[PDB]
């Protein structure tokens, strides 16, 4: 069995290997990459996402979110307070202000220590989940707006045509902005490209050990667990590496830099934080190996997680027993 320790693998495709997205994902899996839950892909040196980032300041962040923490430094929840709209140029200036800028630090490890010691004491502002793309339309390889759609994959594998669309989303971050512990909707894959700016640190639990993370989460967040059997779908819970190590949870960590892709694999729980002003683009995708994970994915029926239009069909076809309950939570 390849990659039995479930380490995060890093890939360097050539330009020829970069031409066929599906084939390369299947290659990475042949080497055991999925066992980690996360892989890094460094594009060939001939590739670029677009020519420059000089013309992005007029993008609007309609609903910036202030991420307010509650709990203790290693075990906390965050909620999202809506703020007034601002442009990417206004957000960048805010990110670089003395109130929000990255502190002086020695290296990534020192910054990670500072994040876990100090995150809860501040409320950074995140531009999340903005529908759109920064890939040039003439970028032909690994263009996140031109991938095969999940609805087309379900049709090819299972024969059923379904409604829905699959589009990318932008993320504008600053120091301490945080993505809470989660798997993707319907335990899909994700691909994430860091277009510009400062790094993003990731934590991940191997898919084969996901239930260990869920059990610890129910212990650490006992009221949230009573409220919802799939409360990590709310995307609010943070647990530090130190706490994970104290509780014997298997995980890995890696830092993504500008110009790099990360792939998350079905049922790979992940969390992380931004080092400073940055912009990432992400989208969900599927392969034939996802289908069996999609059939088994948990679902939030409490009302909180409130998702996309296109998840309806996935629940309806893959999880018909759960459909009625899950839809009552959506309405
Ligand atoms: O960058 C983000 O805020 C978080 N990314 C992801 O959850 C992803 O691409 O799977
Ligand atoms: Mg612009
Ligand atoms: Ni994700
Ligand atoms: Zn819920």
From Swiss-Prot:
Zn(2+) binds at residues 228, 234, 300, 302. It is found in: Nucleus. Fe cation binds at residues 182, 184, 270. Its EC number is 1.14.11.66. It catalyses: N(6),N(6),N(6)-trimethyl-L-lysyl(9)-[histone H3] + 2 2-oxoglutarate + 2 O2 = N(6)-methyl-L-lysyl(9)-[histone H3] + 2 formaldehyde + 2 succinate + 2 CO2. GO terms for cellular component: blood microparticle; chromatin; nucleoplasm; nucleus; pericentric heterochromatin; site of double-strand break. Ubiquitinated via 'Lys-63'-linked ubiquitin chains. Deubiquitinated by USP14 with the help of TRIM14 leading to stabilization. Binds 1 Fe(2+) ion per subunit. Its cofactor is Fe(2+). Keywords: ADP-ribosylation, Chromatin regulator, Dioxygenase, Iron, Metal-binding, Nucleus, Oxidoreductase, Transcription, Transcription regulation, Ubl conjugation, Zinc. GO terms for molecular function: chromatin DNA binding; damaged DNA binding; histone demethylase activity; histone H3K9 demethylase activity; histone H3K9me2/H3K9me3 demethylase activity; metal ion binding. It is an enzyme of class 1 (oxidoreductase). The keyword Transferase does not apply. One of its GO terms (biological process) is cellular response to ionizing radiation. 2-oxoglutarate binds at residues 126, 192, 200, 235. Residues 8-50 form the JmjN domain. The modification PolyADP-ribosyl glutamic acid is found at residues 16-17. The keyword Nucleotidyltransferase does not apply. Residues 136-302 form the JmjC domain. Histone demethylase that specifically demethylates 'Lys-9' of histone H3, thereby playing a central role in histone code. Does not demethylate histone H3 'Lys-4', H3 'Lys-27', H3 'Lys-36' nor H4 'Lys-20'. Demethylates both di- and trimethylated H3 'Lys-9' residue, while it has no activity on monomethylated residues. Demethylation of Lys residue generates formaldehyde and succinate. Belongs to the JHDM3 histone demethylase family. This is Lysine-specific demethylase 4D. It comes from Homo sapiens. The gene is KDM4D. The chain holds residues 11 to 341 of 523 of the full protein.
């Amino acid at each position: 069995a390849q990659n039995p320790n479930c380490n995060i693998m890093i890939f360097h495709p050539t330009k020829e290997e970069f031409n066929d997205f599906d084939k390369y994902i299947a290659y990475m899996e042949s080497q055991g990459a999925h066992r980690a839950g996360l892989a890094k892909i460094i594009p060939p040196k001939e590739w670029k996402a677009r020519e420059t980032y000089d013309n992005i300041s007029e993008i609007l962040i309609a609903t910036p979110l202030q991420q307010v923490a509650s709990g203790r430094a290693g075990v906390f929840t965050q909620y999202h307070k809506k703020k007034k709209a601002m442009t990417v140029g206004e957000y960048r200036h805010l990110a670089n202000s003395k109130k929000y800028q990255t502190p002086p630090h020695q290296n990534f490890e020192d910054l990670e220590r500072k994040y876990w010691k100090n995150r809860i004491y501040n409320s950074p502002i995140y531009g999340a989940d903005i529908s759109g793309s920064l890939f040039d339309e003439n970028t032909k390889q690994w263009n996140l707006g031109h991938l095969g759609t999940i609805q087309d994959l379900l049709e090819k594998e299972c024969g059923v045509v379904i409604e829905g669309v699959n589009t990318p989303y932008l993320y504008f971050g600053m120091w301490k902005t945080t993505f809470a512990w989660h798997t993707e909707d319907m335990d899909l894959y994700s691909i994430n490209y860091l277009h510009l700016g400062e790094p993003k640190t990731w934590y991940v639990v191997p898919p084969e050990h996901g239930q260990r993370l869920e059990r610890l989460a129910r212990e650490l967040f006992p009221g949230s667990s009573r409220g919802c059997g799939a409360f990590l779908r709310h995307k609010v819970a943070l647990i530090s590496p130190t706490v994970l190590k104290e509780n014997g949870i298997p995980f890995n960590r890696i830092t993504q830099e500008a110009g790099e892709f990360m792939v998350t694999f079905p049922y790979g729980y992940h969390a992380g934080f931004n080092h400073g002003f940055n912009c990432a683009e992400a989208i969900n995708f599927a392969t034939p190996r996802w289908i069996d994970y999609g059939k088994m994915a948990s679902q939030c029926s409490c009302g909180e997680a409130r998702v996309t239009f296109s998840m309806d069909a996935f629940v309806r076809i893959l999880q018909p027993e759960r459909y009625d309950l899950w839809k009552r939570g959506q309405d």
